[PDB]
Design a protein around this ligand. Structure first.
Ligand code: ANP
Ligand code: MG
Lengths: 196, 194, 88, 176, 254
């Protein structure tokens, strides 16, 4: 039966409801496109036969293959769109430079879309204020204390806090720093907020 | 705020959502039909498929081929939506297994209504009353199963009901984390696993 | 570009594509090869030729192809493990 | 909306503190506060009060409604009535948590206050459960929930609203 | 627990017996003649009573002697699953008393009385005896009377009586030495005595021939069966343990 290969893409995405991005199914997309090509060629031959030859009984089969083509298009578009939704979520969940192990899951065109989305979002944030914009990626949770105590999880390098001052993010060192400075690193897992 | 959310299901509405994975999976499930006209070359899949032949084919294909005067094919309801099983639902909705009989019981049943069956009214009332019967137990189990194994509660629920169950669980866990003071901490996102 | 400078890619059969040596879990080449490497030589030669051949006119029927379409015959490759038994 | 956001709105409520520091009137965007005189009461928002308590810069006083007899009367009235009774604050649960967790030393009979507020919370959540069940059973299209607080709604409202959306579509699927 | 479909079937089909026999046990490949014989066992002969009081049974008795893993047990289990009043039995799990009838005391009263055994319960039905070679001869003494005369005679409790046991027997056995030996006669590969073997209408020898052609098609069928999954079940589901899933006194889908 037709359109069974289209379901594999959909099931792959559906069985990861957590929002993680699987590897792009290049060959599955290729196979469904080839199925659409075969369907279209058969329908071209049959519609030519039905019109030029006047053969009327082929019309149900014409409608059959056309419906199958529509189904395959729907599945392809839905798969690509849900992958775009997950990729869009990654910018807010993690940051701008995605980890390499995750970048290898993305298609080249997906990376192009993500770069365009990052550029457009940066433009929008830049256009909000009088100057220097508003980073609406920050303040994701309501503010409690102005300063927080944070613990280094990774051996990061140095991290500037004022114009002339920086903290060395060596593992297990603890720093008492502004929340608005530490939020992105905590989000990315470099730092751990250590009061609860 | 900016978390990932899939496209929501539109299967209970007049038409299903184009980009919804749930609706796509729901419409893949097979529907019994009878061919009202012969279909050349189609015997390769099921030579022509003869006129009057009984088939079970996907709901998407049946909706594509169907028309209100039944030229290509005519549709039979699945047995779970016929009068026999409607009576079982009417007996007690809380004991039936809509995961076996679905897992998209309500969505599939709602989409059957577009085939102009004479018992559309009975189907609609059955779906509505099944939901009304199962609401209280979905609410209680979702909002009062805390920090335990919910698989026994979730086993017999259809996908719509399971979505509602997870919503109730989210509310419960959110309030409990707030009450215990765990909502204050700033945390690495779920992508920190890699 | 010297021969020892050439980068290595491995053909993943279940993704049907070439992946870098940095991405696969394959060990790095060394001069004193292991027993596995000697097998992998000829297995990889076969692999390249196999994937190349299956994408020529010896490709799928296709499974959608029907009889009036695909009225003409097409080759179908077999492996040695398949020809023993009822295939005699 | 998160419970933390409900707490953020609860944090805007005004409470009385007794500073141990001297500070002139401060002209915040959301309205001016002070002057802060040592040893005298001054009324400030709850976020500021909690921050000053954490920094040891003031003594927090209980609100007028945090009294055991008043809370017992309100609890008994809630248990007797069928509808939600008017609450002493629109964010009473959040107020109770914040004030008693950060200032139990200042607030006497804090155990009794916490238990009574817990009693009122349990009664009102039970009433809300009854309301949801009645809505779905009788197939209502509208309900009146006058004295519910935001935290009480937010505990159950997402689930309830999703269920009612599904119910509406199920009872209107034959419309065309 | 109408006739038009059956009438159309018998008139439309050519050799409906063959179609029924090959459709009988789909999950077992081959064994076409054994499937035909089991279909004959299911349909039964006709019971004849003559003017002189002499009697001929209608029941058909089949014995399967064979190598390990030739689906004897699965054929017996199919007949157990599909025939009406098919009673399971195994050689070591049963006794003569349990095969025929036991004295038990009515807990209501306290009086001793008979309680029917497997072959008595199988009257006008089938008894499927797996591991038939593992059974004791003292237990098979009862089977002699049941197969020969369609009855079992008892003298126990207050009662000396002739119980009806008009059942077909579908027996499965291994040859002695486990695997059938080509370099020994069939009557010494079959460990049972000819007096007992006379009772069975049909006696099939089932050998695990290692022909690669039959191995290929059999393994293809077996792997297809192991790849099957039910329609109401997800791809990763483990098999559920049973429950009271019947929730109407009559069947709902039909
Ligand atoms: N021809 C066959 N086709 C399909 N499955 C088979 C076949 N032969 C054996 N099997 C499988 O092999 C397994 C064992 O079959 P079984 O019913 O025990 O045969 P058996 O001869 O009665 N075993 P045993 O009691 O030792 O003699 C089952 O899972 C059968 O389905
Ligand atoms: Mg056996």
């Amino acid at each position: 039966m037709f359109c069974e290969k289209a379901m594999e893409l959909i099931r792959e995405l559906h069985r990861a409801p957590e929002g993680q991005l699987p590897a792009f199914n290049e060959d599955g997309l290729r196979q469904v496109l080839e199925e659409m090509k075969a369907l279209y060629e058969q329908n071209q031959s049959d519609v030519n036969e039905a019109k030029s030859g006047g053969r009327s009984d082929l019309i149900p089969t014409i409608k059959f293959r056309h419906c199958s083509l529509l189904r395959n298009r729907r599945c392809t578009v839905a798969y690509l769109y849900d992958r775009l939704l997950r990729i869009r979520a990654l910018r807010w969940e993690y940051g701008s430079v995605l980890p390499n192990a995750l970048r290898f899951h993305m298609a080249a065109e997906e990376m192009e879309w993500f770069n365009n989305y990052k550029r457009s979002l940066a433009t929008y944030m830049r256009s909000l204020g009088g100057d220097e914009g508003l980073d609406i990626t920050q303040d994701m949770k309501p503010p409690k204390s102005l300063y927080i105590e944070v613990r280094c999880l990774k051996d990061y390098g140095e991290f500037e806090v004022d114009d002339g001052t920086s903290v060395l993010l060596k593992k297990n060192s603890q720093h008492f720093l502004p929340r608005w400075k530490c939020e992105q690193l905590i989000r990315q897992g470099v730092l751990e907020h250590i009061l609860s | 705020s900016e978390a990932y959310f899939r496209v929501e299901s539109g299967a209970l509405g007049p038409e299903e959502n184009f980009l919804s994975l749930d609706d796509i999976l729901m419409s893949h499930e097979k529907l019994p039909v009878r061919t009202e006209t012969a279909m050349p070359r189609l015997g390769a899949f099921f030579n022509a498929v003869p006129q009057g032949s009984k088939l079970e084919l996907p709901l998407w294909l049946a909706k594509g081929l169907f028309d209100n005067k039944r030229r290509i094919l005519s549709v039979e309801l699945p047995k779970i939506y016929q009068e026999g099983w409607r009576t079982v639902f009417s007996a007690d909705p809380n004991v039936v297994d809509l995961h076996k009989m679905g897992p998209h019981f309500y969505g599939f049943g709602s989409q059957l209504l577009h085939f102009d069956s004479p018992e559309n009214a009975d189907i609609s009332q059955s779906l509505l009353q099944t939901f009304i019967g199962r609401f209280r137990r979905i609410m209680d189990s979702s909002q009062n199963a805390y920090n335990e194994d919910t698989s026994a509660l979730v086993a017999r629920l259809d996908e719509m009901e399971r979505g509602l169950f997870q919503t109730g669980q989210k509310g419960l866990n959110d309030f409990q984390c707030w009450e215990k003071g765990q909502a204050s901490q700033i945390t690495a996102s779920n992508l920190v696993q890699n | 570009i010297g021969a020892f400078d050439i980068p290595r890619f491995v053909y993943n059969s279940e993704r049907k594509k070439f992946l870098p040596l940095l991405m696969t879990n394959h060990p790095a080449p060394n001069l004193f090869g292991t027993p596995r490497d000697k097998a992998e030589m000829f297995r990889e030669r076969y692999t390249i030729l196999h994937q190349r051949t299956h994408r020529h006119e010896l490709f799928t029927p296709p499974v959608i192809g029907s009889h009036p379409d695909e009225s003409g015959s097409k080759f179908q490759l077999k492996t040695i493990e398949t020809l023993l038994g009822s295939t005699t | 909306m998160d419970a933390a956001e409900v707490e953020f709105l609860a944090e805007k409520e005004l409470v009385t503190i007794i500073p141990n520091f001297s500070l002139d009137k401060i002209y915040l965007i959301g309205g001016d506060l002070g002057p802060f005189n040592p040893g005298l009461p001054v009324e400030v928002p709850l976020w500021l009060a909690i921050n000053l308590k954490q920094r040891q810069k003031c003594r927090l006083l209980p609100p007028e409604w945090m009294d055991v007899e008043k809370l017992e009367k309100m609890r008994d009235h809630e248990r007797k009535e069928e509808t939600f009774t008017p609450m002493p604050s629109p964010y009473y649960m959040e107020l109770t948590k914040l004030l008693l967790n950060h200032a139990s030393d200042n607030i006497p009979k804090a155990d009794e206050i916490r238990t009574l507020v817990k009693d009122m919370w349990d009664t009102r959540i039970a009433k809300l459960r009854v309301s949801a069940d009645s809505f779905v059973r009788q197939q209502e299209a509208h309900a009146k929930l006058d004295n519910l607080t935001l935290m009480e709604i937010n505990t159950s409202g997402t689930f309830l609203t999703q269920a009612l959306n599904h119910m509406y579509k199920l009872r209107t699927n034959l419309q065309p | 627990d109408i006739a038009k479909i059956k009438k159309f079937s018998k008139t439309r089909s050519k050799d409906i017996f063959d179609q029924l026999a090959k459709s009988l046990a789909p999950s077992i490949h081959g064994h076409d003649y054994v499937k035909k014989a089991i279909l004959c066992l299911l349909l039964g002969g006709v019971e004849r009573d003559l003017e002189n009081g002499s009697h001929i049974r209608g029941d058909i008795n089949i014995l399967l002697i064979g190598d390990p893993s030739v689906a004897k047990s699965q054929l017996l289990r199919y007949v157990l699953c599909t025939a009406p009043r098919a009673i399971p039995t195994t050689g070591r799990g049963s006794s003569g008393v349990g095969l025929t009838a036991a004295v038990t005391t009515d807990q209501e009263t306290g009086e001793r009385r008979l309680e029917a055994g497997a072959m008595v319960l199988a009257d006008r039905g089938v008894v499927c005896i797996d591991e038939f070679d593992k059974m004791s001869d003292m237990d098979r003494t009862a089977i002699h009377e049941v197969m020969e005369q369609g009855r079992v005679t008892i003298a126990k409790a207050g009662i000396h009586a002739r119980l009806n046991a008009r059942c077909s027997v579908l027996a499965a056995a291994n040859p002695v030495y486990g695997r059938y030996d080509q370099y020994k006669t069939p009557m010494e590969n079959i460990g049972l005595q000819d007096s007992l073997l006379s009772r069975f209408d049909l006696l099939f020898i089932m050998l695990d021939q290692m022909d690669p052609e039959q191995d290929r098609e059999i393994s293809d069928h077996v792997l297809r069966m192991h790849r099957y999954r039910a329609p109401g079940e997800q791809d990763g589901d483990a098999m559920p343990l049973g429950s009271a899933v019947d929730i109407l006194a009559t069947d709902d889908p039909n």
